Design a protein around this ligand. Structure first.
Ligand SMILES: *[C@@H]1O[C@H](CO)[C@@H](O)[C@H](O)[C@H]1NC(C)=O
Length: 321
């Protein structure tokens, strides 16, 4: 069914709706129909909701949205179409939504964002999430056109195969950029386009085997999550990090790290904080000597407490002769 409170906040509580409820009026201020069985949105469904501020359609089976389905939604600020079955995106959907501050299109099976810029006029957008884990393979220069200031941009480009240079270059500022990408071949391509516009960069799922590194970066924090790394690739990645003059925070937690090359952190003189926890550190002595000693010398940098595999003792508590 669909229950609305006195304030116009409506929710599709039970998962049984086969389509958007009929008869919605100008009184509806929020519509959350997540986890239902909607598969199609027609032009008339939301035609009277001129005061709708949030539309959440997460996890439905939507595969078709008629061209002008959102025409009357000029008051819309939050739109979530995440995890549906949209194989292609239409710029006409976003044309009437200039007030948007949050847009989530994550989890839909589209290969690219389309042949037409989708966000050219979303001048108030703060959070944008696009991509998917298995089908998204290309990023084009026309994507993101129009976007100048963003608080958070999340791109799941797990299967990214192509990246048109300067695609991300047009955005003047992005506070937090999260990039999911399995391969590293396009990493430096993307890096040069965002080094001067991103404050916090987060790289997820990347296989860094065989990665090699050979300006005025403004990145202040770099986070790695679920990346595949080794002493050799960590050294190459550090060559890149060593070049970021103002790098203040480095998050290396959750990357299945077992060790680090001796002296790996010696050139990060401007670093203020480092995260090394949630990693199965091999605290056998010869191997862990550098890291244990480094944590004690730079006693104020570690955030959280890195622990040893097996014993679970703090890495900094290990002393090798
Ligand atoms: C998406 O649009 C492209 C270009 O028209 C088309 O080739 C593709 O089949 C569409 N995806 C599907 C199957 O919905």
């Amino acid at each position: 069914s669909l229950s609305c409170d006195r304030n116009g906040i409506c929710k599709g509580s039970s998962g049984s709706l086969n389509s958007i409820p009929s008869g919605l009026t100008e009184a509806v201020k929020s519509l959350d129909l997540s986890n239902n069985r909607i598969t199609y949105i027609s032009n008339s469904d939301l035609q009277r909701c001129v005061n709708l501020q949030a539309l959440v359609l997460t996890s439905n089976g939507i595969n078709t949205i008629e061209e002008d389905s959102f025409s009357s939604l000029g008051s819309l600020e939050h739109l979530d179409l995440s995890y549906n079955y949209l194989s292609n995106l239409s710029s006409s959907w976003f044309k009437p939504l200039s007030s948007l501050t949050f847009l989530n299109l994550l989890g839909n099976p589209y290969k690219t964002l389309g042949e037409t810029s989708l966000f050219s006029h979303l001048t108030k957008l703060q959070i944008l999430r696009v991509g998917n884990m298995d089908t998204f393979t290309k990023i084009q220069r026309k994507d993101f056109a129009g976007l100048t200031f963003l608080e958070e941009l999340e791109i799941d480009a797990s299967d990214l195969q192509s990246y048109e240079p300067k695609s991300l270059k047009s955005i003047q500022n992005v506070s937090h950029l999260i990039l999911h990408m399995k391969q590293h071949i396009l990493l430096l391509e993307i890096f040069v386009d965002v080094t001067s516009s991103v404050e916090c960069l987060e790289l997820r799922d990347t296989d860094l085997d065989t990665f090699h590194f050979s300006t005025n970066s403004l990145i202040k924090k770099f986070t790695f999550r679920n990346v595949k790394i080794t002493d050799e690739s960590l050294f190459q990645v550090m060559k890149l990090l060593n070049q970021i003059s103002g790098l203040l925070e480095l998050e290396f937690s959750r990357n299945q790290l077992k060790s680090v090359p001796d002296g790996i952190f010696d050139r990060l003189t401007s670093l203020q904080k480092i995260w090394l926890h949630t990693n199965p550190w091999d605290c056998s002595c010869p191997r862990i000597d550098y890291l244990s000693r480094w944590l004690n010398k730079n006693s104020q940098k570690e955030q959280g407490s890195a622990k040893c595999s097996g014993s679970g003792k703090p890495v900094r508590s290990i002393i090798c002769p």
